[PDB]
């Protein structure tokens, strides 16, 4: 949902939310990866769990909104970038 630009999450966020101790969250996060809700690696010393991938989920209220936002960012970049690619290398461009 929330990050287009990043995909890493801190533990501390879970911890406060749950109101469950820090020691448990590291262990809970490990179960999360094993089920396959998320795939990635956990780096303890940076205090992040980095998601390489997120499981598909059936239509949710938060979800549909994020997808649109990311498609918009994507359209805009592709048009800007198209001008750069076309602008340079004139002699092969035909």
């Amino acid at each position: 949902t929330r990050p287009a630009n990043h995909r890493q999450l801190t533990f501390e966020e879970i911890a406060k939310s749950a109101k469950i101790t820090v020691n448990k969250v590291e262990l809970l996060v490990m179960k999360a990866l094993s089920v396959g809700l998320v795939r990635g690696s956990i780096d303890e010393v940076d205090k992040r769990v980095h998601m390489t991938w997120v499981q598909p989920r059936v239509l949710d209220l938060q979800q549909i909104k994020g997808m649109k936002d990311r498609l918009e960012l994507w359209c805009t970049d592709v048009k800007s970038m198209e001008l750069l690619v076309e602008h340079q290398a004139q002699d092969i461009l035909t």
Partner: protein, 64 residues
């Protein structure tokens, strides 16, 4: 092919967004597969690194 590629991506990319709108309002039936696949595209993202070229091409040419 690379110049065209960017243009191709744009033509395809618009459709994906209108489809998402239709489901939201202007009611259209959801094909579940499509929604499942969409979310996958955004998650793989990393940032860029290196790649560069040497002074060597010039040396040969100067020899001639």
């Amino acid at each position: 092919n690379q110049v065209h590629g960017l243009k191709g991506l744009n033509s395809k990319l618009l459709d994906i967004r209108t489809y998402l709108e239709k489901v939201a309002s202007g009611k259209l039936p959801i094909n579940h597969h499509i929604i499942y696949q969409l979310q996958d595209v955004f998650n793989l993202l990393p940032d860029a690194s290196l790649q560069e070229f040497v002074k060597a091409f010039y040396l040969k040419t100067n020899d001639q």
